[PDB]
Amino acid sequence: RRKHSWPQPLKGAESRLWYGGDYNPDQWPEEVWDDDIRLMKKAGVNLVSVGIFSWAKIEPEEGKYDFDWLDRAIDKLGKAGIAVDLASATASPPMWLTQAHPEVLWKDERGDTVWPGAREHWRPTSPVFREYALNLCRRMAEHYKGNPYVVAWHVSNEYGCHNRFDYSDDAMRAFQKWCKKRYKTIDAVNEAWGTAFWAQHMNDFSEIIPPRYIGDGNFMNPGKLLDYKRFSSDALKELYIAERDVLESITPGLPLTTNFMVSAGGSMLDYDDWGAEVDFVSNDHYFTPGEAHFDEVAYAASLMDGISRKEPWFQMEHSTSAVNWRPINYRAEPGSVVRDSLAQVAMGADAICYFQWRQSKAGAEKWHSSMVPHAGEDSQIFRDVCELGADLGRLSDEGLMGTKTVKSKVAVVFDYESQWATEYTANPTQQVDHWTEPLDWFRALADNGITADVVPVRSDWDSYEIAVLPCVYLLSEETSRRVREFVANGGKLFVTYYTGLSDENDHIWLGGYPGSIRDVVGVRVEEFAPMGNDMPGALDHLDLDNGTVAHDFADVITSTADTSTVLASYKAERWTGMNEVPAIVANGYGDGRTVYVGCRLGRQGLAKSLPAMLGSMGLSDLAGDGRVLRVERADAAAASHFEFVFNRTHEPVTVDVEGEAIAASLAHVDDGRATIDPTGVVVLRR
Amino acid sequence: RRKHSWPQPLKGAESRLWYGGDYNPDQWPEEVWDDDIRLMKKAGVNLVSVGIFSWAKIEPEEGKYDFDWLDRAIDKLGKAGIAVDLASATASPPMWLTQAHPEVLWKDERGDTVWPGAREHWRPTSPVFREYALNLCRRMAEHYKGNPYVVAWHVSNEYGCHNRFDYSDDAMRAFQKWCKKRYKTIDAVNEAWGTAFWAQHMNDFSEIIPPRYIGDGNFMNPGKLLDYKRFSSDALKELYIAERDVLESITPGLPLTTNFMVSAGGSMLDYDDWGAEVDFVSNDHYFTPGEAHFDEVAYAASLMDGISRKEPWFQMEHSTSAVNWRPINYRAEPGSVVRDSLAQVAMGADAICYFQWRQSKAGAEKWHSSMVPHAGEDSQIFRDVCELGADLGRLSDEGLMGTKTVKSKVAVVFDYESQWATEYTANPTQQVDHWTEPLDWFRALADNGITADVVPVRSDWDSYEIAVLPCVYLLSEETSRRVREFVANGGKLFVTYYTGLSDENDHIWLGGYPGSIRDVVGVRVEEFAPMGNDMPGALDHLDLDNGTVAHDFADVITSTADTSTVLASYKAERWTGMNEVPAIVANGYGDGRTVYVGCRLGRQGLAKSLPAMLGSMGLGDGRVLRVERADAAAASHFEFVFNRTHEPVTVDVEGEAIAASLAHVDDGRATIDPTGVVVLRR
Ligand SMILES: OC[C@H]1O[C@H](O)[C@H](O)[C@@H](O)[C@H]1O
Ligand SMILES: OC[C@H]1O[C@H](O)[C@H](O)[C@@H](O)[C@H]1O
Ligand SMILES: OC[C@H]1O[C@H](O)[C@H](O)[C@@H](O)[C@H]1O
Ligand SMILES: OC[C@H]1O[C@H](O)[C@H](O)[C@@H](O)[C@H]1O
Ligand SMILES: OC[C@H]1O[C@H](O)[C@H](O)[C@@H](O)[C@H]1O
């Protein structure tokens, strides 16, 4: 795991929260760069990221390099006090390159070539692409070594945004070597993937092909498909590593990151794995319109803080308002510029950046919002960007930098590989993915006044007072041991449906679900009852006797341990078999306590059930006010303490706050009660 | 047509209803096999099917053969008194074979290769593949000939489940030769397919190409697309016959089957045509979750009984509960294991088998339910499986085997080819397929207390008192003549919308629909009025004046015969032009009677309309389905009674109860809970 290393101030500057965004001067005539500088100063901008897609400007024909334009941009910025996060420029190749070498282009499942015309159209395991990317890394680093305004490297851009999967022969060769590395022998691959089924036995590694097109509606080997997702992520990781090491060899000490795609529903790479390979962890994240907007912003940023192991992290990108890439690109509610950003700050970010500085006037993303909209500086969004800039200056003034988000009492577990496993098309239902369950729990906890930490499965969730396994479909023998020990030593554990069905190879744990920990949770599931409305007359819901209603899935629990207590059962017509089948079950195991939730209750059913579940674990006094989210950052050694309070509702609320208000948006504090409007936030120093 | 020949008992054993499932010892350590025997014995299993996907295990590299594992498995079964339905193992090839011979893989409409990774990734007309398959068949037969525990061959597995269509050049060459066989001259092919339209004329057989990709949203030649379905079925049939013939030539007398995919919505192959090529007919059927569950299980089993020409047939596979392959794999309601299976027996099956014996712990079907679940023997499904095996024991004690489901008074006609024709994408409406209408009729009749027989169109539907032609879109001159004679000679006939629109090559019968039999039904339709919800302000339903409602489709009947009676008409706003258009028309023709239903009424509307319609033809309790089997030579009669509702039900029954689940019989009254069933001897 790399040592944490954060981009440092310019020569003649103090440590500040970083504020800025992507900057693309190559899109605008040189004249406008003066105007950019003026407005950056007005907004309180001190860092921007440049060159991300500048390969064709920097190397405009093969072996010829043109730096003067970027040298002049960087100067301008730096003389104005604005620090630069320099890209490798290797995110997307120029047309001369792909024309000269069409073998760089990735191939889809059907073997069809993905052409230029958009971006990132290259095979992650192409050796030709790699040679070109590393050559550009060598040249960039050599040219910018010692530049006094460059403070970090932004390596490539969102690896696997578009090229996560390749099915070319480069990928086939790489996947063969990856399997050999993982499994050693073809026999162990055969064992992993259960190939005795459907005559898929392989005699050697040359018989391993990627999961190519097998006809619509047909079912791929699921162990192979899961491994293909692991491999894809590793393959891109290995390119990133090669790029990083080239840059670092020339510019030792200049911190390197690459930008992740962490959001509740995003699982393109194992971002917990990738977090070990950056000096500081950085995220790209975009609000979900509608009711989930705030809470998922908060969730994603919390997951980021888990991936960063509570080290400060970097919000590389987000949007002031609408994006370009949704079917309907709803605008953000007014106040989102400040509020969302301060939620990312609350959850541990020490940098806040947007895609992008100035709204493009041509190309695919011209309709994506920016800090300077098409409308120009006379706009509400620009005033809001200036307001946030001032707010971040003020939090910098009060010494926010380097505080860490406090440890919660509750860890909500997230597992990228479990999400991958739930994507298989011949699971009990295609309506259940892992990822929705942890978001629901985070939100239901917030409804009960509790801010949880979203914690990756390989991290220290088992160090928390309380933990949640929300649809953690894979549990290895090792993670299973961690579960038994956690509970036996006095841990309090929630476990749900779709948890621990299989080991890490997607081999089912037999004897009754969940096969590896059923003795800890004190239940046994013999079968499932998925639900929905695609079949007239089929079950679409199951009422519980505590006034909640299950949808989509329910475990058919057919026995409970002597130590267990049924807290809720289903109500259903006799013929279904589900009437009075246990739905929510408490248990005691060693010094700890569990609650097993056999169905999907959603945010509203979990929020309602949480007081009774918590009470069965001996925790009735976690009761609190869910109309707001309270998030705390501290440096315990320095005795500094900050509180971030967010209205989660559509009506103004007034709540008791301690300390001195150091920032406010759509909110006001009159001793010592904070009146917070919708989309509003206050920040206090204690 | 092949002489019926049923798999016979092990030496020394008696005739019994067969009970079992797919068995895959290859997936489990040999020590688990001991556990399998014990549990099979407990569950009353007496037959399993083995080796179905074992090619890679039996021929693990090119030219090397490894039989010992399978010899041991079979010996172990047979010694415990469990018979073996042995597969050819040619269902899907090993990676070594596809790696060395990529030309075996099928290609889709776009010419894209379908790779290994799942199953059955081979071209039906690949010569290379056929050589490989026939070699394996030969070797398996030479090796297993005389084995005392193998009672039948299970040839390949579900031909056309994934590889029905291939558009490779092997398919191109084969379809050319099939056309020449069918039409003799290129002029005849041009004529059948109407190639004067859109500059499609062919000068020779080399200008016939498969219905390959023509761009999305475009319209293929329909006659060609229909012939491609007949061709694709035939091609797989030709391979099946070749494999069968190899096996039979080595083990004469061992009965042969291959497993079908017969279900209401299933039409991969013309299964009535394939039923002539098996010694006994075998089916794979999986229940439809929700309201259609029981009726459609029954319907499909009836069709299987039609395909078998009432000879006993073999339920090769079904599920105990959830499958893996649906978007939401709903579980089976309690009682289903016994009930669904006894429905298949009632409709004529003398063997009941599931996919599969032990639920897989790895691979694409591990979430598919089995006889022994992941949970193991301590499970409701396994107890249910054990009860079923007892019940089939009792039924075997009582002489069930060999009895035939009785001849109904009503034949519901089903036609694979008419279903193919209704799949064309520029038909009057893409919401109408043939298959839904015979199922609606079977259910509507049951609602009136009648158990229909589902009878394939080439079979003896015209020997029945009453028959239904439900959206039989194709009627050849020959079939049209059967219709006319059936009725003229005293038959009673229902005919629906979408019946008789075209001949066998999809040329429209001109002059008013249905153009070959409008004189028999006494109606004339000039245009159609399709309906639906995708165009605001367009018609979405038509009330009838008998208090039912039509959806999706109505006939514009503009005249009726002097001999006819309108039984119901539409009511609608004037501007639609449908107001008072006749909807249901009765007729007299010769000594017989017809009724023409010009719209889709669903199970609901048909069920309600049935007394008036039947009444016009000069003619029970729908809460249950009553199904009967019988043998006169043994003087036996058996009645199976199934509750069709979500409420307990009590009904009169005659005879001795010989089996029951979620039901009991007291003083000749049967109280049957939901999902329950009783079987009586009379
Ligand atoms: O839609 C999901 C995906 O959408 C866009 O492509 C965004 O740029 C990504 O960061 C990601 O959020
Ligand atoms: O939302 C659009 C945005 O998505 C990601 O975050 C990318 O890294 C950006 O370059 C941009 O395409
Ligand atoms: O468990 C009873 C069961 O066992 C035997 O093997 C028979 O073949 C079955 O017909 C039935 O008698
Ligand atoms: O979806 C139709 C098809 O579904 C699965 O493939 C089953 O294998 C078949 O027997 C059939 O029911
Ligand atoms: O339902 C799954 C089942 O489908 C068919 O019936 C097949 O023949 C079996 O091998 C199995 O794939």
**A553/A498 Cα distance (integer angstroms):** 9
Q: Which CATH number fits domain A625-686: 3.40.50.1360, 2.60.40.10, 2.60.40.1180, 3.40.50.720?
A: 2.60.40.1180
Nearest chain A Cα to B662, which residue?
A575
Task: Give the DSSP H or E segment for A125.
Answer: none
Ligand 5 atom at shortest distance from the alpha carbon of B286: 1
Number of H helices, E strands in chain A: 17, 26
**B305/B106 Cα distance (integer angstroms):** 33
Whether B158 is catalytic is: yes
Instruction: Let me know: does A585 contact A556? Beta carbons within 8 Å.
Output: no
Instruction: Let me know: does A112 contact A76? Beta carbons within 8 Å.
Output: no
The beta strand positions in B135-179, using DSSP E, are 150-154
Nearest chain A Cα to B55, which residue?
A199
Which 3 state secondary structure label does DSSP give B151?
A: strand
Residue A131, number of CB atoms within 10 A of its CB: 11
Nearest chain B Cα to A225, which residue?
B117
- Closest C-alpha residue for ligand 2 atom 1: A323
**A153/A83 Cα distance (integer angstroms):** 12
What are the residues whose beta carbons fall under 8 Å from the beta carbon of A634, sequence distance 6 or more?
A: A403, A404, A406, A640, A641, A642
Instruction: Let me know: does A146 contact A3? Beta carbons within 8 Å.
Output: no
CATH number of B621-682: 2.60.40.1180
**A316/B667 Cα distance (integer angstroms):** 80
> Which amino acid is located at B305 in the chain?
D
Ligand 4 atom at shortest distance from the alpha carbon of B265: 2
CA B644 to chain centre: 21
**What's the burial of A423, exposed, middle or buried (CB within 10 Å: 0-12/13-18/19+)?**
middle
In the 8-state DSSP scheme, what is residue B44? T
**A295/A317 Cα distance (integer angstroms):** 18
Cβ-Cβ contacts under 8 Å between A and B: the total is 208
Tell me whether residues A212 and B115 touch, CB distance under 8 A.
Answer: yes
Q: State whether CATH 3.40.50.880 applies to domain A404-624.
A: yes
In the 8-state DSSP scheme, what is residue A107? B
Ligand 5 atom at shortest distance from the alpha carbon of B119: 12
Ligand 4 atom at shortest distance from the alpha carbon of B317: 10
- Give me the half-sphere count of Cα atoms (radius 13 Å) on the Cβ side of residue B438: 35
Three-state helix/strand/coil letters over A39-83:
HHHHHCCCEEEECCCCHHHHCCECCECCCHHHHHHHHHHHHCCCE
**A70/A56 Cα distance (integer angstroms):** 13
Residue with tokens 């200049």: A254
Which 3 state secondary structure label does DSSP give B392?
A: helix
Three-state helix/strand/coil letters over B568-584:
EEEECCHHHCCCCCEEE
Beta bridge partners of A372: A358
CA dihedral A37, A38, A43, A49 (to 10 degrees): -10
Torsion sign, CA atoms B212, B213, B217, B219: negative
The residue ranges of every structural domain in chain B are 1-403, 404-620, 621-682
Which 3 state secondary structure label does DSSP give A662?
A: strand
**A50/A581 Cα distance (integer angstroms):** 59
Name the active-site residue from B317, B437, B504, B628. Answer: B317
Residue with tokens 């021929």: B59
Q: What is the CA(A355)–ligand 1 centre distance, in A?
A: 12
C-alpha distances in angstroms, A153 versus A53, A157, A654? 14, 11, 44
Which 3 state secondary structure label does DSSP give A667?
A: strand
What ranges in A251-335 are assigned the alpha helix state H?
A: 271-274, 293-307
CA B331 to chain centre: 22
Question: CA angle A23-A24-A30, nearest 5°?
Answer: 115
**B165/A42 Cα distance (integer angstroms):** 66
B325 CB neighbours in chain A (<8 A) are 219, 426
Q: What is the CA(A39)–ligand 1 centre distance, in A?
A: 28
B298 φ, ψ (degrees, to nearest 5): -65, -40
Q: What is the CA(B324)–ligand 5 centre distance, in A?
A: 10
**A496/A249 Cα distance (integer angstroms):** 47
Of A215, A224, A574, the CB nearest to B108: A215
Instruction: Let me know: does B312 contact B350? Beta carbons within 8 Å.
Output: yes
- Give me the half-sphere count of Cα atoms (radius 13 Å) on the Cβ side of residue A264: 22
Q: Give the distance from residue A103's alpha carbon to the nearest chain B alpha carbon, in angstroms.
A: 20
**B238/B379 Cα distance (integer angstroms):** 44
Two tokens at B259?
A: 């497993």
- A214 touching B (Cβ < 8 Å): yes
Q: What is the CA(B534)–ligand 4 centre distance, in A?
A: 29
**A49/B375 Cα distance (integer angstroms):** 55
β-pair type (B599-600, B592-597): unpaired
Residue B52, number of CB atoms within 10 A of its CB: 26
Beta bridge partners of B652: B669
**A375/A363 Cα distance (integer angstroms):** 17
Two tokens at B411?
A: 């034949």
Please tell me if the CB atom of residue B47 comes closer than 6 angstroms to any atom of ligand 4. no
**B358/B375 Cα distance (integer angstroms):** 10
Please tell me if the CB atom of residue B355 comes closer than 6 angstroms to any atom of ligand 5. yes
Q: Which of B549, B682, B551 is nearest to B626 (CA)?
A: B682
What are the residues whose beta carbons fall under 8 Å from the beta carbon of A142, sequence distance 6 or more?
A: A250
Q: Give the distance from residue A574's alpha carbon to the nearest chain B alpha carbon, in angstroms.
A: 9
Torsion sign, CA atoms B79, B83, B88, B92: negative
Instruction: Let me know: does B123 contact B129? Beta carbons within 8 Å.
Output: yes
- B642 touching A (Cβ < 8 Å): no
What are the residues whose beta carbons fall under 8 Å from the beta carbon of B218, sequence distance 6 or more?
A: none
- Name the closest ligand to CA A364: 2
Residue B110, number of CB atoms within 10 A of its CB: 10
Torsion sign, CA atoms B594, B597, B602, B604: negative
C-alpha distances in angstroms, B464 versus A585, B408, B418, B470, B621? 59, 8, 21, 16, 22
What are the residues whose beta carbons fall under 8 Å from the beta carbon of A545, sequence distance 6 or more?
A: A568, A569, A570, A571, A583
Tell me whether residues A221 and B118 touch, CB distance under 8 A.
Answer: yes
Mark which residues 399-438 of B lie under 8 Å from A by CB: none
Instruction: Let me know: does B514 contact B497? Beta carbons within 8 Å.
Output: no
Which 3 state secondary structure label does DSSP give A540?
A: coil
Ligand 4 atom at shortest distance from the alpha carbon of B261: 10
- Name the closest ligand to CA A269: 1
Instruction: Let me know: does B370 contact A516? Beta carbons within 8 Å.
Output: no
**B111/B7 Cα distance (integer angstroms):** 42
The residues of A carrying an active-site annotation are 158, 317
In the 8-state DSSP scheme, what is residue B59? S
Three-state helix/strand/coil letters over B222-261:
HHHHHHHHHHHHHHHHHHHHHHHHHHHHHCCCCCEECEEC
Tell me whether residues A214 and B361 touch, CB distance under 8 A.
Answer: no
> Which amino acid is located at B248 in the chain?
E
Residue A100, number of CB atoms within 10 A of its CB: 13
In the 8-state DSSP scheme, what is residue A10? P
The beta strand positions in A497-625, using DSSP E, are 523-528, 542-544, 549-560, 565-571, 582-589, 592-597, 599-600
C-alpha distances in angstroms, B284 versus B251, B260, B328, B344? 25, 6, 20, 11
Two tokens at A684?
A: 């206090």
Residue A446, number of CB atoms within 10 A of its CB: 25
What are the residues whose beta carbons fall under 8 Å from the beta carbon of B659, sequence distance 6 or more?
A: B342, B391, B394, B395, B678, B679
B333 CB neighbours in chain A (<8 A) are 575-577
A209 CB neighbours in chain B (<8 A) are 115-117
Please tell me if the CB atom of residue B261 comes closer than 6 angstroms to any atom of ligand 4. yes
Question: CA angle B90-B93-B94, nearest 5°?
Answer: 135
Instruction: Let me know: does A530 contact A551? Beta carbons within 8 Å.
Output: no
Q: Give the distance from residue A571's alpha carbon to the nearest chain B alpha carbon, in angstroms.
A: 15
**What is the Cα Rg of chain A in Å?**
26
- B53 touching A (Cβ < 8 Å): yes
β-pair type (A653-656, A150-154): unpaired
**What is the Cα Rg of chain B in Å?**
26
Torsion sign, CA atoms B229, B235, B241, B244: negative
Instruction: Let me know: does A522 contact A561? Beta carbons within 8 Å.
Output: yes
Q: Which of B512, B509, B517, B498 is nearest to B589 (CA)?
A: B517
Q: Give the distance from residue B288's alpha carbon to the nearest chain A alpha carbon, in angstroms.
A: 8
**B404/A26 Cα distance (integer angstroms):** 83
Q: Which of A122, A133, A210 is nearest to A162 (CA)?
A: A122
With b for 16 or more beta-carbon neighbours within 10 A and e for fewer, the B76-85 pattern comes to: bbbeebbbbb
Whether B296 is catalytic is: no
Instruction: Let me know: does B334 contact A473? Beta carbons within 8 Å.
Output: no
Two tokens at A259?
A: 């930008």
- B64 touching A (Cβ < 8 Å): no
**B581/B569 Cα distance (integer angstroms):** 5
Of B94, B374, B646, the CB nearest to A199: B94
**What's the burial of B575, exposed, middle or buried (CB within 10 Å: 0-12/13-18/19+)?**
exposed
Rounded to 5, what percent of chain A is helix, strand, coil?
35, 25, 45
β-pair type (A150-154, A83-87): parallel
**B20/A341 Cα distance (integer angstroms):** 63
- Resolution of the experimental model, in Å, one decimal: 1.9
- Closest C-alpha residue for ligand 2 atom 11: A355
**A574/A502 Cα distance (integer angstroms):** 31
Two tokens at B406?
A: 């009785």
Which 3 state secondary structure label does DSSP give A88?
A: coil
Q: Which of B52, B59, B295, B374 to mutate to test the interface with A (most CBs of A within 10 A)?
A: B374
Q: Which CATH superfamily is domain B1-403 in?
A: Glycosidases (3.20.20.80)
Two tokens at B176?
A: 């050319």
Residue A265, number of CB atoms within 10 A of its CB: 12
Q: Which of B508, B514, B516, B543 is nearest to B526 (CA)?
A: B514
Q: Give the distance from residue A220's alpha carbon to the nearest chain B alpha carbon, in angstroms.
A: 5
- A3 touching B (Cβ < 8 Å): no
**A672/A191 Cα distance (integer angstroms):** 64
Two tokens at B143?
A: 């090796």
Residue with tokens 């597992």: A415
β-pair type (B564-571, A640-647): unpaired
With b for 16 or more beta-carbon neighbours within 10 A and e for fewer, the A597-606 pattern comes to: bbbbbbbebb
First to last CA, chain A: 34
Mind giving me the DSSP string for A439-468? HHHHHHHHHTT--PEEEETTSSGGGSSEEE
A507 CB neighbours in chain B (<8 A) are 361-362
CATH topology identical between A1-403 and A625-686: no
Q: Is the peptide bond before A514 cis (omega within 30 degrees of 0)?
A: yes
B327 CB neighbours in chain A (<8 A) are 429-431, 534
The residue count for chain B? 682
Instruction: Let me know: does B456 contact B438? Beta carbons within 8 Å.
Output: no
C-alpha distances in angstroms, A228 versus A201, A648, B614? 18, 40, 62
Mind giving me the DSSP string for A600-649? E-HHHHHHHHHHHHHHHTT-GGG---TTEEEEEEEETTTTEEEEEEEE-S
Instruction: Let me know: does B144 contact B216? Beta carbons within 8 Å.
Output: no
A559 φ, ψ (degrees, to nearest 5): -160, 160
- B329 touching A (Cβ < 8 Å): yes
**A239/A155 Cα distance (integer angstroms):** 10
C-alpha distances in angstroms, A570 versus A437, A528, A565, B379? 20, 14, 15, 20
What are the residues whose beta carbons fall under 8 Å from the beta carbon of B385, sequence distance 6 or more?
A: B43, B320, B337, B371, B372
Beta bridge partners of A495: A469, A596
- B96 touching A (Cβ < 8 Å): yes
Please tell me if the CB atom of residue B317 comes closer than 6 angstroms to any atom of ligand 5. yes
**B54/B522 Cα distance (integer angstroms):** 58
Q: Which of A189, A200, A208, A524 to mutate to test the interface with B (most CBs of B within 10 A)?
A: A200
- A374 touching B (Cβ < 8 Å): no
Q: Is the peptide bond before A99 cis (omega within 30 degrees of 0)?
A: no
Task: Give the DSSP H or E segment for B388.
Answer: helix B380-397
Tell me whether residues A537 and B291 touch, CB distance under 8 A.
Answer: yes
- B265 touching A (Cβ < 8 Å): no
Contacts 24+ apart (CB under 8 A), B193-196: B193/B221, B193/B223, B193/B224, B193/B227, B193/B505, B194/B221, B194/B223, B194/B507, B195/B221
Two tokens at B537?
A: 């302000």
- Closest C-alpha residue for ligand 1 atom 11: A261
CATH topology of domain B404-620: Rossmann fold (3.40.50)
Q: Give the distance from residue B359's alpha carbon to the nearest chain A alpha carbon, in angstroms.
A: 10
